[PDB]
Design a protein around this ligand. Sequence first.
Ligand SMILES: [Zn+2]
Lengths: 63, 63, 63, 75
Amino acid sequence: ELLQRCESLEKKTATFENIVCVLNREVERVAMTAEACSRQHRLDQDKIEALSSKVQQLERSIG
Amino acid sequence: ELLQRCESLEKKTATFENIVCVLNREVERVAMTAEACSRQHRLDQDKIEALSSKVQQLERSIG
Amino acid sequence: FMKEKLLAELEGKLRVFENIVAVLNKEVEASHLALATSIHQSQLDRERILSLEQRVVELQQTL
Amino acid sequence: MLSCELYRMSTYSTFPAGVPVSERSLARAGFYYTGVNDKVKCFCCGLMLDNWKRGDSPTEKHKKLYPSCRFVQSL
Ligand SMILES: [Zn+2]
């Protein structure tokens, strides 16, 4: 009953620490990844803008 | 006293478990849609390189 | 009465855990939004790419 | 037990949205949330800071505005 219920609890919250500690790593890591995804995208767009610039120039140099 | 403390904490405890459940699921969905975001980038980065390669060949062709 | 003092100890830690998880929850969300945004702009970006390939094939064939 | 950084982070459950800096680097920089607006506080030297602009560095602003902070010296 109640003695075992309490024991279950101090066992549960003991484990809760490492759960949080892990999640904190995993969330930081994922945030990291997503950030690096955005960054990578921004570099591509810049590459597209450049390729886009160059083809307007060719079109004007040709027709 | 101790009975109601334990009953209460058993609720707050289950509450915590619920939050953590969902958070983990979302980390997983973010992790997955970042893997995919970066798979698409790999596919367009190769298309860009192919364009930049064809645009250089042309530019050389005419000065 | 020291088991009621244990239970107090737990209740407080649990509050900290639930607040940290709140924050982590928020972090994961900002990641998801930054991400879903990056992924969206990159669909319009694949459109510009395919347009550029076509424009460029055109140039290849009037040379 | 959990790190002092994490315990500092846990003070951010009620932090506003729209703020250009993460509660993470705010906590890592030694600040806890004061509960008021976007205002945080160094537990140690007691420097309080608010109105955070896009791309701010919480750490650099702590070293600059109070180089004397015992905490900001270990970081
Ligand atoms: Zn300080």
